[PDB]
Amino acid sequence: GSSGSSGMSLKLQASNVTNKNDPKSINSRVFIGNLNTALVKKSDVETIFSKYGRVAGCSVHKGYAFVQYSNERHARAAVLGENGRVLAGQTLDINMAGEPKPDRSGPSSG
């Protein structure tokens, strides 16, 4: 039997210049979008994702909802696990928490 390399590469990137973001609770977090947030509650969505693992903190907003986990895996699981699901007719758009800024710039460092 033989086995090749599959998982190994792990780059972070994007680490410089100040910003107006909170890196707190960014380790393991999920951003639930396209959420009607009209019928779906936090207590519910909680038991929905809770499956992936107890959420450190969840927050339901009008239009979207957030979910925090202890491990980075408990998130990804809930990320893909949920990401793609439909609710109310719309496909719950979920993704990992951690987005850059909508803007580009030259090589400013040196």
Which CATH number does the domain housing residue 79 bear? 3.30.70.330
Domains of the chain: total: 1
SS3 30: strand
**Would 11 be classed as within a structural domain?**
no
90: amino acid identity, one letter: Q
**Would 80 be classed as within a structural domain?**
yes
**Would 9 be classed as within a structural domain?**
no
CB 52 within 8 A of CB 78: yes
Number of other residues whose CB lies within 10 A of the CB of residue 7: 5
Please tell me the distance from the alpha carbon of residue 13 to that of residue 31, in angstroms, as a whole number.
20
**Would 13 be classed as within a structural domain?**
no
First to last CA, the chain: 50
Angle between helices 73-82 and 42-49 (to 10 degrees): 110
| Technique used to solve these coordinates | NMR
Please tell me the distance from the alpha carbon of residue 109 to that of residue 79, in angstroms, as a whole number.
34
**Beta-sheet strand order (sheet of 29-32):** 57-61, 64-68, 29-32, 94-96
Find the domain containing 103 and state its range: 18-107
- Which pair of tokens denotes residue 105? 């710039």
CB 56 within 8 A of CB 68: yes
- Which pair of tokens denotes residue 74? 């408990």
**Would 1 be classed as within a structural domain?**
no
